[PDB]
Subunit: 133 residues, 4 copies
Amino acid sequence: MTFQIQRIYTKDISFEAPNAPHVFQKDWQPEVKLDLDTASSQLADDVYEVVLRVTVTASLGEETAFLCEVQQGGIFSIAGIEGTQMAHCLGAYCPNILFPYARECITSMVSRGTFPQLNLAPVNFDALFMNYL
Amino acid sequence: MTFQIQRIYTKDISFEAPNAPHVFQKDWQPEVKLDLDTASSQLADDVYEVVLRVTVTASLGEETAFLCEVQQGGIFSIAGIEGTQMAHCLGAYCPNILFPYARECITSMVSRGTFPQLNLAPVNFDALFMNYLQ
Amino acid sequence: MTFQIQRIYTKDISFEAPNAPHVFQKDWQPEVKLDLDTASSQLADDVYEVVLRVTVTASLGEETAFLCEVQQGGIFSIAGIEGTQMAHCLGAYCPNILFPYARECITSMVSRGTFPQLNLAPVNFDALFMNYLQQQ
Amino acid sequence: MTFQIQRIYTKDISFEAPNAPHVFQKDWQPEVKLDLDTASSQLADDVYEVVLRVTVTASLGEETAFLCEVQQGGIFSIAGIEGTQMAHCLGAYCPNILFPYARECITSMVSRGTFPQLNLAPVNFDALFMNY
């Protein structure tokens, strides 16, 4: 086969601390909720675009601490592979490459908002793909 | 008198690259529009919040390259002054303290989008305050 | 068998652009040389640390553009595996898990250096290990 | 004065956590030491490079938790001022512009090393300039 990463970029970034000023009085580890989405598309022949969307909802007590979302995209060149092997390349292999980027983006945004450190636990995309089927 | 930065933080951040995949093919001939907005607030006696909103729009003709908005806030302990003095501090001095941080947040977002570097030009807040002041 | 990632962290990060800013006068794609190095060590029973060292040497023309090095470590819980299989999980499986984070780290520092984007190409550690074995 | 930011970039970044593994299970009571240094130089007519070096040391006694250093550069077009005015622009105004990027850079490195959040307090480059 043939695989080549052509570009990696953030298509969309969002961070919100609606109750920010006053919710700071609540100093502790906020309950976090993570959500993932992966969608691809063919930009040209053997040139695809995979997008990884990661949403993190956090709350302190009974109120929102912050909401953060990121859509991390990448352009890849895939050849030789096809059928199921391809579905797995774009649905698990590429998102796995992009996860570190989205993860860091979220960590950076959370840090900018002056909230407690937030490190997304590693995700097994291979396992997640096995549930998509 | 007493000035004290108690906290610097981004209340909101938004970056959008609608035609992301393809807009990278277009030649880099952007029109960058900048919009600034300021708002203060008393949170407690002598404790004020100042929020600087910086909005950046970049277009390649009629096709938007990316939109960046950032609400850079800060909590300040101010005391000993009032009237126009305090008004100047919250409308010019404080936002001037916040701009450098909003600048870096925007550069970082733009760089994450994988667009050419963008470093906002300094802003004369003392001049914008005067225009309003009279 | 049991396998859980307990932590991912950077033990050492290094970025250097010795010829900056004059070297920025060369606005084209840098040639990139990549070097990998791995290692591990047991911390307890069924607990191991694996460290992946990625070194990137880039140059524009006949002069250095930048040097970037990263030591990406991780602590893993591994049980139910032994002998040759454990050595491969440590010298290949784990390094392969750490590479994604090392790439993102390198991309980020290269971007902070304001050089063209660098996204390291995937690496087949299985091949790199088998080649390592037939050399001892 | 004719001021214009031409480019901002890190010339050097270094992060080290020698006893990384073990140090993670130690009682978090570090002695954070910060050190700021600033230098400048002319590149061409009215074009200057300003470099802000930030050094952070985190120790639990003699047990170093991590050492982080960043050299944050910036190329600036400056014309119209000179003497004390130009001197202040290079030693405080420009560094003030670079501090957010050096601060963020340190924050990220420390976060990447999975150590507790480290947010450098604001710096009054105008006050430091007075001393000099």
